[PDB]
Design a protein around this motif. Sequence first.
Motif: not given
Lengths: 407, 204, 626, 140, 35, 148, 275
Positions: B14-15, B17, B164
């Motif tokens: 996944r990137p 953001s 996060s």
Amino acid sequence: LHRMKDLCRYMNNFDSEAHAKYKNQVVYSTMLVFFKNAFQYVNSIQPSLFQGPNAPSQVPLVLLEDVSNVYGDVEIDRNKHIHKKRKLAEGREKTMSSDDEDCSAKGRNRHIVVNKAELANSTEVLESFKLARESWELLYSLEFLDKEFTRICLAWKTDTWLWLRIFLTDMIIYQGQYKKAIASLHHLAALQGSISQPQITGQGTLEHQRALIQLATCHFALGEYRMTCEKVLDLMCYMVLRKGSDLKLLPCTSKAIMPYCLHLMLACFKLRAFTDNRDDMALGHVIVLLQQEWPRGENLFLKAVNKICQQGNFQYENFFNYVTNIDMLEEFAYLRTQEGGKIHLELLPNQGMLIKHHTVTRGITKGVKEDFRLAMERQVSRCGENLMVVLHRFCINEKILLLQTLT
Amino acid sequence: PTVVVMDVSLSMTRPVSIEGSEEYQRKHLAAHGLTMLFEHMATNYKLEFTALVVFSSLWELMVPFTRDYNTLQEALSNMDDYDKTCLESALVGVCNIVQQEWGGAIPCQVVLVTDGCLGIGRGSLRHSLATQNQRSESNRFPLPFPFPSKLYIMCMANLEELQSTDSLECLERLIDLNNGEGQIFTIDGPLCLKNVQSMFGKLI
Amino acid sequence: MKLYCLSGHPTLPCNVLKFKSTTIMLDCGLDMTSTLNFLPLPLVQSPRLSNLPGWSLKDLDKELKECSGHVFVDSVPEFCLPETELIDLSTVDVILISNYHCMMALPYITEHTGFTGTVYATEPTVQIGRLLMEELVNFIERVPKAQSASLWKNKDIQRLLPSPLKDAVEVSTWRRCYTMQEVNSALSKIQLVGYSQKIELFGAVQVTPLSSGYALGSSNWIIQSHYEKVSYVSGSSLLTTHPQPMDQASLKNSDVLVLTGLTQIPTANPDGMVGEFCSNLALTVRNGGNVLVPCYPSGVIYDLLECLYQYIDSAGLSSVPLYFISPVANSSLEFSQIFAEWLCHNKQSKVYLPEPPFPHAELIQTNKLKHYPSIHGDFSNDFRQPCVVFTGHPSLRFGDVVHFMELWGKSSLNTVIFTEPDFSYLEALAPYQPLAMKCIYCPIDTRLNFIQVSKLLKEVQPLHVVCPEQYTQPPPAQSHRMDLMIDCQPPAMSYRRAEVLALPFKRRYEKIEIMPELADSLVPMEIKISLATVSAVLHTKDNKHLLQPPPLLSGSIPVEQFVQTLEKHGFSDIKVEDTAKGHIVLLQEAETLIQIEEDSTHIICDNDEMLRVRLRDLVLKFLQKF
Amino acid sequence: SIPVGISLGLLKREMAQGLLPRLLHGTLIMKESNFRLVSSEQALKELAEHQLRFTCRVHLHDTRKEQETALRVYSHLKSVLKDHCVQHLPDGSVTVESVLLQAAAPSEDPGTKVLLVSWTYQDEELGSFLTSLLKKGLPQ
Amino acid sequence: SLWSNRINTANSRKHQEFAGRLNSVNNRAELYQHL
Amino acid sequence: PEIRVTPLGAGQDVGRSCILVSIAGKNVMLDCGMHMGFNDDRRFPDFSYITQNGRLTDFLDCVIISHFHLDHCGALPYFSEMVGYDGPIYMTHPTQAICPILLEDYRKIAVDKKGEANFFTSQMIKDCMKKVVAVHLHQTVQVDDELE
Amino acid sequence: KSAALHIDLCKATSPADALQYLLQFARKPVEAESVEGVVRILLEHYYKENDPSVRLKIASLLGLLSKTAGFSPDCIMDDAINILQNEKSHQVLAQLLDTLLAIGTKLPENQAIQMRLVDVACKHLTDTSHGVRNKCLQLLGNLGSLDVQKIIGDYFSDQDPRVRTAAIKAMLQLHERGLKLHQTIYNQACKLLSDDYEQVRSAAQLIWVVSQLYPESIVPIPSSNEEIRLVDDAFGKICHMVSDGSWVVRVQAAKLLGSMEQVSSHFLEQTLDKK
């Protein structure tokens, strides 16, 4: 403001009949001058509402009060919750139309916050806002003067005439009363609808763009989670192209309209997270929608994930549909592993409904792996898509499926 | 005289953001590796050889014994992961293997590339291992071993993604484990990662 | 800030740029493709056209004539002008001719629209443009034809008509040919400027042409306002071509770039095409046939005949004669010869020696190259059957090419070549479809192809790029070759015909001049960087702002140093107290009050002369002039 | 000649004033191998920008009332200034160029009347000269 | 002053000189001194 | 701010025109003339004036010629080659075409006077002019960063 | 059939297709009642739309409609001056000033309309854009006959050369109308003769006009105390102006110099010799 302060300073110390009469006359004259100055500033700054759009004027703009302090996750009004807050908002009074109250004096400590790059003349707007705040504070400095001003405003019958409504909205914007501005915008939209042109029951349109902007600003400023959710659902289903309240300047074009849905969804998620009645589904939805601010939002999402952990019996129809941010997916993957919950979960689009229909086994695991691979391929195909489309689609799907489930 | 480790974690796919610097998944770039630096190192150091050994929780093998690293890298692909994310045990095993192989008198450096994912609050127990004199309870702590060794973790990510996913926090904790015996980058955000090229050039 | 685009043609731009207090018309760019629909104008009325059938009309068949399933207008050819009605052409003041091809239709704009500004160009472009305009006017007026078909232009009939006419856009805007008197009127207003010659417009805008390298005289323009530069790209060539080599450095650091004049059918390699054309004419001569090469008198025929004489000397096929027929053929050759400064370094080295640049003068002296103004002008007596002919207009709707190919249309032994990449040759052969004549379409396009312009952009890296939407899409012939696709890290927006574009650049600062006395007025003080402030009257004449003599105060004073200075000064009645809302001190020396509060500051000073002097001195000790 | 740049808004305002006596200020910052002029409002973008303004007090002694005297002063000034003032302010204030004249009560003393006036140095010289001219002689 | 500093910068932009201008008194210069 | 000008030759007479200017520290060579009848090798200017020996290109970066007349370009060959110079030279193209044959004919005429001991050569004239850069009319060429 | 035009315009998309539809409607001919309807439809859409280019095109079409011979343009003039008061964009303002030129040429008899046009023209002349200034000066030149002369003379000293050319052309137009000129314009034009640009000098014809109007008038030299007639000093001005390097200006100067035949021959003999 300096002259008004000097006059009040001399008036308060002196106690005499003639001195009191002179002070009252000076207060009335200062109130009239302040009203005239506010009207002149409103006319010069944005005369778009004053005349036709084709008429010459400055660049269009819309005024909205910042709600950063209210939107804070940590700043949760757990003491009052929702029921007591709603009762206080009602105030044990009739719900009929009313105005000319001015039951707040936050303008004195309020300051204009805006980026200098947004507008070259932002300094002038901030200076005008400060002068208006000083004038309002001077008007509200004396109880008798404030009462006289309120009585004059009530006698003016601002809710009767369109021009009076516009003047009242400008005065409220200068002071800070967003409710009066919203009511004036609604009245203007109703008047526009009453014309021979087509009319709708508050639907998104170019004529009703100001009313929609005012409604969005009021929803953002208030902590009404249900109203924000209803507005977000309506927008998705039918889309149209320090302390105290702060003020900011934003463009009135479609740029602000587009982020309104995302801002409303974020505000609703923050309100749900701050609600006393915590729930696993609500915590997960808030965590998915908390990827807008940091580091407080990240901490809140982590706390929600830890609280949920391995609940297992979680109800979610399109939980993955609304999630577009990679941080939420990473957090969910970490929670699904042995670190957080040590229990299997579902993350593919509509995986929860499919998983609930059959027992988990080797074949179900292979099917889930195939679905995840297909979802990854689909994501790779359209990786450039923003999260706004995903949020709008999820909101529209939720409204189509279980809109009546609310309340 | 060098060790290369590539992470193929699903989290890196996944990137940060929205997207990446090169508009591609970080996991794919990590699996591919630094093409320019590796090619330069291979070409300049023609007389260099290396071996790949993988051992995390149980004995396993996927690349047969061969001098060429390209064959081992090709054989490593098309494999299934296992449910295991041990960090302290894996590090202890790697240190034991290094001590058994190179002994305690051969001058060499050992570098391990691991994400070291952890948590905030819940994963607070990791601090006890990093501290040797952590009161009388941790007085008889085998970690760190009585031999010359060090662990280094290098990564780059956005501030929001780091908070996060605990990416930069894990790196800070790892640095703080060795009493801050290293440097920390001050830049953050969408800034490039040109320091990797400079480090590769300095090392060769 | 505003760019208006009038012509939808890719290689024939007609754009208007609104730049600050001036507006620039970029090019005229006559669209010659419109004439292809009309019936050709033979020099001698052929029986075939007379017996050619009409076409059905419900509302009267003489209006139109049909051949090979394609309906053609049986009237005088008309030209598609740019959509000039979008912007009042009287307003614009400057026209920047880029090449002799782009200056076509200039009489229309200069005369009809009432334009009263000025025009600029290079001398070879002006001369060759004069040649082309007079020769095409001569072609139209040699055999006048009536405007006998007008009702066909209605939109209803156009919808009723098949695709080869329905595809036409803005038929109503089409116009009949201008006259030589209008050409003389238009060329009177032109001003001659050489390469890299700065020209100032009203003391506000600098404009300069640079060597495009495509054809001699052809130039690429730039527009500058010191802090804002706009660069215009036209037909350019990086190949080993005769003109002065293309300049690349001057276009750097350009805010907005406008791209025009890319190659039609970019896949074609010009060198291989020239070699293949030489092979075709060689085999035609070997079989005993005749080769017809319709082309302009421009640089294309020049380098074509260069390679051609070299090829036939290599092959020893010099026996056959060379025939170049045009009303301005001799003038074109001599103009090419004399303009030696505008050519490349090889030609300049050659002309340093007494020899002329091109070698066809040697052929003329030895009579191995022959040219005549027309057919009747003694060329008939000197004509020989086995030969190669260059003549007429490449549109095949007029010129001596019509009569020549009508003469040789029946015989399959003869050959016809095409070399001008400006028309679809299938449409050109449509009025002459039933023939055994062998036709080969091998265009030579020396302009920049997609990869060359992409390399140019990657080498220059301009902030923004503007081009027609045709480039933004792949060609309709392939529609799959993604390599022939202009690639830009910026979005590189585009436009269609009659599309108005707003430039993204919004620079908000221009130049001004200052005289030294104002500069000396400042007394900078060290802070960390220098600070200064002045006050002068603004004078402007011819958009040249000037400053000559006929400011805010930031007196950041630290609290502790001020307290120390006040204590040292010896003033009586000094009281210091610490309370809420900042520190407040009451001084009864002169009834002065000093208040310190966050986000505010108030200063009180009496009108006493001595107290004023002391305050001014105290401020001056810690005054920052900004 | 020293080449520098000018903010577009300042030049627009200057041209508007010139089209229909007023002189333009100048504020420049030394830059890397160049110099640039910037307006006061635009200079604030450098943030910090702590603005300090002087406010001198002009004292007069007369038994006449305030508002009528203010109207008389306004009439006298607009007669002397050759109708250069074509603008007004809501709170009975008249401004010329960039100086604000408003009526303000004194701090504590009722027996003396004092007003506050603020100006820059270029306005300060003109204001001082005009006050000296007024004090030289008036129909008092 | 700003002008003073600016002129210093302009003067600092210097290069080689000619021996004859250094030797020149009464402005006029001598050519072919040997002759 | 200073302008330095010190022409030598033709300032009060005709012939041997040579104007040396350093407007902003950038030396500009505006003309290099001669005057016949100077059998004592006074035809050319004093190359030692710039500096006794050394590379002229170090000091000069621009050379300008008016037209092909010997009083404007007669001393160009010896000054450019014998003294030693390979820096930029700017002059119009027709002047570049007319100049070499005139210089060569003048050199031959000087040979006829047997004063060619310390005079030009054909080969060095060809080498120098082949190195000369032409200029077009109104060609605002930027020869330096600040000088045009 | 105005309904067809109305519905086609409504169905047309505002940004791009509207421009093409208006162009197509403009090319085809129109009728008097059709003009009277489409002008109001154009004004309503002009109010509704806020794009610059579209409003510019609407103003251009208003100008084209105003040139119609058979139309009676009276109310549309009122609407035009109203939108002129409301207009903001300078290009659209210049186009509307072109429409005012068209209406002034169409109806030069109404004096009240003429003074309305000149006062609104001088009101909009305060704008900074050079184009609207040129258009306003053209209106002032065209509309005259018994202060405007002094107003345009003040604008002779404008910085923009295009405005100066417009001023001199307006003076020439006003002279063509036959109004009696002043004498102060001579020295102002004499100041203009030193201008760098060519069109201003060529137009500054004006000194020839003023010399023809009052050739016997006595004029004093600013430096010399001797008195010289307007004709002789103007002759000398043209004589030393012919030395200018602008060939168009030289041809203009020689041609207008030939038109002068009210000067003493002794001065001509003095100035034609080489010494």
